[PDB]
Each structure stands twice: as C-alpha cells, then as structure tokens.
Amino acid sequence: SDHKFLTQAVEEAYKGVDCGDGGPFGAVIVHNNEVVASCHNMVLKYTDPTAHAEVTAIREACKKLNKIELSECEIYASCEPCPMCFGAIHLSRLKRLVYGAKAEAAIAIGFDDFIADALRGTGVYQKSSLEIKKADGNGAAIAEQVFQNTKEKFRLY
Amino acid sequence: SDHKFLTQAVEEAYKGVDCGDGGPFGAVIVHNNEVVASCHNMVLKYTDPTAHAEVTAIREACKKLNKIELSECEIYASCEPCPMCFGAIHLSRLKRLVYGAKAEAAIAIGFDDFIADALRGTGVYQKSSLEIKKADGNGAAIAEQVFQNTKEKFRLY
Ligand SMILES: O=c1[nH]c(=O)c2ncn([C@@H]3O[C@H](CO)[C@@H](O)[C@H]3O)c2[nH]1
Ligand SMILES: O=c1[nH]c(=O)c2ncn([C@@H]3O[C@H](CO)[C@@H](O)[C@H]3O)c2[nH]1
Ligand SMILES: [Zn+2]
Ligand SMILES: [Zn+2]
C-alpha cells in the first residue's frame, strides 16, 4: 500500500517539473486503496502560490467526492507538507498523512526554510493528532533524491 | 485607511454568510490603498475546505496582477488567519497583515481551536517576518461582533 502510493506521488513530482506546471512535489489522495486525486504542484501553471501539490490534490478530491471532508481518505506527499499544506490537510480532515522526503531535502536546493511546527510537534497553539508516517527505506530514499535530480529543470518560487 | 479596508473585509464576511457561500470571514488585499481583491470564505460554494477568505483573496490578487508574489500588497482579514491561511500569506510574500478579531472569537461559536503559532510569535520551525497588526478599538469591536451577529446563520465546517 504505502510504497505504491508514495511512488505515485514521486512520479507526479517528476511529471510536474517536466510539464513546467510547478516545482518537484506530488501528492496522491486515496480512499480505501482507490485513488481519488493524483496531482503535482501547479503554482506556475495556475499563477497561484497556494497551488502546492497537497492543496491541489485536496481541492480535486473534494470536488470529485462532493464533500468538503476527506475523513475516510489518506494523503501521500512526495515531500513533507509545508505549514500551509499541513493546515489544509488538517482542515480537510484527512485521516492519515504519509510523506517521503524531509523538508530539509527541498530546502537544500533553495526552497524557503519554511517548516510546519504542528507536523513536527513543536507548537504552543497548534497541535495535531493526525496520524503521520514518515516513510523509510526504499520509497523514502527515492523520494529524497527528487530534489537533486530535478534541480536544474525548474525555477525556484 | 486600515479601518476602511478592515471594515470592507468584515462586510465581505457578512455578505458571504448571507449568500450561503461559506462562513463569516472576509479578506481584502490592497496595493498602496487600491483594492486588488475583495473576498469571503467560499468553502461551501466551492466544496473546497481550502477556500478560506484569505486563500481566496490571495488566489484572486495573484490572478489580477498576473504573478505569484504580492510583496507590494497588504492583506486585511476580518478574523485572525488560521495556520493554513497564515502559511499562504507567507508564501505569497504579502508585506503586511491587519486582522480584526482574535481566533477565539470564531472558536467561541463553533470553529476548531486551530491557531497559527507563527502569527502569535510562538513558531519554532515557521518564522514569519511580515508586519502584523491586530486591530484595536472600533476595528476590533466590529470584527468581534461578526461572530455574535452571524451565529446560527450558516452551516459550520
Ligand atoms: O507542501 C509543499 N507542497 C508544494 O507543492 C511545494 N512547493 C514548494 N514548497 C516549498 O518546499 C519547502 C519544503 O516544504 C518549503 O519552502 C515549501 O514552501 C512546497 N511545499
Ligand atoms: O483563516 C481563516 N479563514 C476562513 O475563511 C475560515 N473559515 C473558518 N475558519 C476557522 O476559524 C477558526 C479561527 O481561525 C479556525 O477554526 C479556522 O479554520 C477560518 N479561518
Ligand atoms: Zn505546501
Ligand atoms: Zn484560514
């Protein structure tokens, strides 16, 4: 289960940078092993700084399911979600988050040092009880390599 | 002119509640005293839990200006932006936030305890640097009243 959908999110990241749609980030939203949305970062295509992969997937899933809560769904993120996307994941009531690469791997290629306190458990005000899994082993090593692999293929934003 | 634009965001909150578009939240984005976007929460209208007033206004301002950064603009929010919206405000590079009511005003009528550490100055991994003003006096009174005036006028989400 987790390897397959994490891998799908990684493939979306590569697809989006190759499309020119946005940065190397992918996200896949799954409903009891059925894929609901499979998206990548669309900031450049949409001229929308909120159109991260995770936000785009949530928007698409909710529209497809005619529901604003995704409480029976899980989300696979190629990279650790940022504070905005972690907030979106919270609001959408997704029940589980699996992510591949740590935020540091994106920051290593120039992305903003912009990390979600609530994901890392470092907040005073914002807490999370969302079930969160940081992948390890194979899928994770693949996910971490995305940023070195796509560095020269898109413009930072 | 802070009071004028904060009042317009509170107006948007009431209009959206009256429309059935979403909850009692508005946001106005401004360039040197000219309105670039004026929006309210569209979560119900769009079946999109990311379509908070602030995210909606950022998307609309970025479309109107045809670019993904708003570093010359300021944003007026009728209520303290949540972690998702404050993350979007960070990513859009808005240079200043003026907000009307404290989050507790909205929590008091049914919304989640869901507060942005980085806005309140308790973030560790998320470090804001935009200028933030919490409205006082009449601005605060109008903004806090929204939640008493609109109680049980809309579907919670
Ligand atoms: O959650 C995210 N999804 C994206 O699509 C995305 N695109 C760029 N970023 C930035 O990558 C860093 C690591 O999370 C942060 O600077 C994000 O804003 C993203 N973060
Ligand atoms: O920033 C926000 N914009 C909104 O449109 C909105 N709609 C509802 N809420 C919720 O109000 C509380 C105080 O910020 C949190 O539960 C928000 O999710 C909102 N927060
Ligand atoms: Zn994000
Ligand atoms: Zn919000």
| CATH number of domain containing B109 | 3.40.140.10
Contact A46 CB / ligand 1 (< 6 Å): no
CB B22 within 8 A of CB B43: yes
CA A12, CA B4: separation in Å to the nearest integer?
44
Cα angle value B90/B46/B12 (rounded, 5°)? 65
Residue A34 included in any domain: yes
CB B52 within 8 A of CB B41: yes
Contact B40 CB / ligand 2 (< 6 Å): no
Q: What's the DSSP call for residue B21?
A: S
CB A28 within 8 A of CB A13: no
List of chain B residues whose C-beta atoms are within 8 Å of the C-beta of residue A47: 62-63, 66-68
CA A11, CA A147: separation in Å to the nearest integer?
13
Residue A115 included in any domain: yes
CB B52 within 8 A of CB B85: yes
With 0-12 CB in 10 A as exposed, 13-18 as middle and 19+ as buried, what is B65?
A: middle
Structure method: X-ray
Q: What is the domain extent for residue A47?
A: 1-150
Residue A156 included in any domain: no
Catalytic residue among A54, A74, A80, A144: A54
Q: Is B54 a catalytic residue?
A: yes
The number of the ligand nearest the C-alpha atom of B93 reads 1
The strand pair at B96-101 and B74-79 is best described as parallel
Among A58, A60, A69, A54, residue whose Cα is nearest residue A100: A54
Helix-then-strand count for chain B, H and E = 7, 5
Question: What's the gap in Å between B38 CA and the centre of ligand 3?
Answer: 24
Residue B24 included in any domain: yes
Residue B57 included in any domain: yes
Q: How many CB atoms lie within 10 A of CB B151?
A: 12
Residue B155 included in any domain: no
Which residue in chain A has the smallest CA separation from B129? A114
Q: Do A88 and B157 touch (CB under 8 A)?
A: no
Annotated ligand binding at B52? The verdict is yes
Interface of A with B (CB under 8 A): 43-44, 47-50, 55, 58-59, 62-63, 66-69, 82-88, 90-93, 112-118, 120, 122-126, 157
Annotated ligand binding at A40? The verdict is no
Among A21, A27, A22, A20, residue whose Cα is nearest residue A98: A27
Kindly provide the resolution of this structure in angstroms, with one decimal.
1.9
Annotated ligand binding at A90? The verdict is no
Residue indicated by tokens 């946005």: A22
Residue B87 included in any domain: yes
**H or E segment to which residue A5 belongs:** helix A2-19
B35 to A85, A148, B30, B61, B98: CA distances (angstroms): 27, 41, 4, 9, 14
CA B77, CA B25: separation in Å to the nearest integer?
8
B10 to B14, B16, B54, B142: CA distances (angstroms): 7, 10, 12, 8
CA distance A51 to chain B (A): 9
The beta strands (E) that lie in B80-155 are given as 96-101, 131-134
Pick the residue of A41, A73, A91, A111 with the most B CBs within 10 A to test the interface with B by mutation. Answer: A91
How many domains in chain B? 1
Q: How many CB atoms lie within 10 A of CB A131?
A: 11
Residue A102 included in any domain: yes
